[PDB]
């Protein structure tokens, strides 16, 4: 086997910033022959198909902006990204085709960018769901940043953890920011005791939590 | 335009077989070698195996991992590409990728495809509970408004979700399910200026191609 791995697992960089990141196989892919480097690199964006930006080591694939840089030889080899922009949020993968194929493992690159606060949202049960007997009740907490955030729910001012789902979307990659959506799943019966229903959400961007809400008998 | 597209992923039981297909066109099919490439939800990629072109004898060769259990194949005839798997299991669950690879020149994958989910389960296809995300009625609407839609207690994964049939596709954020006793359940947003909404209808369109459901979600006001 030929293995290949990489470093670092991942890190964050901010956008103007140069990004440094390798790949070691366990042998050399130097072909004596062809005296070429069997070594590609890959990148990997949310949601897309890994796309291929060097190869040979250090041939530059047409189309690949200048900014990238593939370097080194033999077992170790380096993908270099100087001044970094959003957009290349994405896992990297360096791939060896000496003997043939092995992927490394992956470095995840993500973007530093300055602290924002959540534009928070709240949405009671819709009617055609409460017809079937069940009540969900959603947050949206929109374009924040760091990632870090706490949520929490409260029904007529007392904490509910219990029936909670939360989801964060990939860094977004044009400004940056993460997404997070917290369900609140009821039985419509539980859902009709209660009164008030409000998400709070905490954030290093200020010391008082966003809240957001609504009362049942309102709606 | 070079194109590659996979088909045939989707629900399949441990110990069961599937084949998966790959369809190609732009450029001339027996010149290049092909591969397989998977990777299992949030984790690495792995290749799997390849099959060679026509100056070496369409031969093939295969990662230890799968070696003995998937087969690779192609129709030269039609520029598809094949992958017949057996004796699945759980670690199979994956995206499938295929990839032109090798053209004897160039050590590369140059082109891939846009990949078919392949979950290995004995839990039942359930298709999904779509529901409308609007603002209660003490909504204080101000100058944006978001709403949403709640794709709800599907299995398997995935789902795809638009908006306004795509052209809505900006300001929306649509967050990765998460699997809660055998059912997933998404949300996806969609924030708008408030001009545009309610007077312009926004809609969700929500496809669950494992049930073959489609479904179309008008976000109605509450009051309105
Ligand atoms: C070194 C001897 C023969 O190898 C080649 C050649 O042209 O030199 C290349 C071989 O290609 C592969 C392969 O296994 O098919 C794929 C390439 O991506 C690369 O990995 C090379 C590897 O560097 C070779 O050791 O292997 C293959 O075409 C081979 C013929 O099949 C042999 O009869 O010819
Ligand atoms: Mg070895
Ligand atoms: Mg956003
Ligand atoms: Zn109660």
């Known amino acids: 086997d030929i293995v290949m791995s990489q470093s670092p697992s991942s890190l964050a960089v901010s956008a103007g910033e140069k990004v440094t990141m390798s790949c070691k196989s366990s042998?050399?892919?130097?072909?004596?022959?062809?005296?070429?480097?069997?070594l590609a690199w890959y990148q990997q964006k949310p949601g897309q198909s890994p796309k291929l930006l060097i190869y040979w080591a250090s041939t530059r694939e047409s189309g690949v902006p200048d900014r990238f840089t593939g370097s080194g030889s033999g077992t170790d080899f380096t993908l270099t990204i100087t001044s970094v922009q959003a957009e290349d949020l994405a896992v990297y993968y360096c791939?060896?085709?000496?003997?043939?194929?092995?992927f490394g493992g992956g470095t995840k690159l993500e973007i530093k960018r300055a602290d924002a606060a959540p534009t928070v949202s709240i949405f009671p049960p819709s009617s055609e769901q409460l017809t079937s007997g069940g009540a969900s009740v959603v947050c949206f907490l929109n374009n924040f940043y760091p990632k870090d955030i706490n949520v929490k729910w409260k029904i007529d001012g007392s904490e509910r953890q219990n029936g909670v789902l939360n989801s964060w979307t990939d860094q977004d990659s044009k400004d940056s920011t993460y997404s997070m959506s917290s369900t609140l799943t009821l039985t419509k019966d539980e859902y009709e005791r209660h009164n008030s229903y409000t998400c709070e959400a905490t954030h290093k961007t200020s010391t008082s939590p966003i809240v957001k809400s609504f009362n049942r008998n309102e709606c | 335009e070079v194109k590659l597209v996979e088909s045939g992923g989707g629900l399949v039981q441990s110990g069961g077989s599937l084949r998966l297909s790959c369809a190609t066109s732009?450029?001339?099919?027996?010149?290049?070698?092909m591969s397989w490439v998977r990777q299992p939800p949030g984790k690495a990629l792995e290749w799997l195996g390849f099959?060679?072109?026509?100056?070496?004898?369409?031969?093939?060769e295969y990662s230890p991992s799968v070696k003995g259990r998937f087969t690779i194949s192609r129709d030269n005839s039609q520029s598809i590409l094949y992958l017949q798997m057996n004796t699945l299991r759980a670690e199979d669950s994956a995206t499938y990728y295929c990839?032109?690879?090798?053209?004897?020149?160039?050590?590369?994958?140059?082109?891939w495809g846009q990949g078919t989910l392949v979950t290995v389960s004995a839990a039942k296809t359930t298709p999904p509970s779509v529901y409308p995300l609007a603002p209660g009625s003490a909504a204080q609407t101000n100058s944006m408004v978001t709403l949403g839609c709640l794709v709800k207690g599907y299995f398997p994964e995935p789902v795809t979700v638009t908006w306004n049939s795509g052209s809505l596709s900006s300001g929306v954020h649509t967050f990765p399910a998460v699997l809660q006793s055998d059912l997933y359940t998404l949300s996806s947003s969609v924030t708008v200026p408030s001009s545009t909404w309610p007077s312009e209808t926004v809609t969700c369109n929500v496809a669950h191609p494992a049930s073959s459901t489609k479904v179309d979600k008008k976000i109605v006001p509450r009051d309105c």
């Open positions: 732009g450029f001339t099919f027996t010149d290049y070698y």
């Open positions: 042998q050399s892919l130097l072909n004596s022959r062809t005296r070429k480097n069997y």
């Open positions: 791939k060896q085709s000496y003997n043939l194929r092995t």
């Open positions: 099959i060679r072109n026509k100056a070496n004898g369409y031969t093939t």
């Open positions: 990839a032109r690879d090798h053209d004897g020149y160039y050590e590369r994958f140059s082109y």
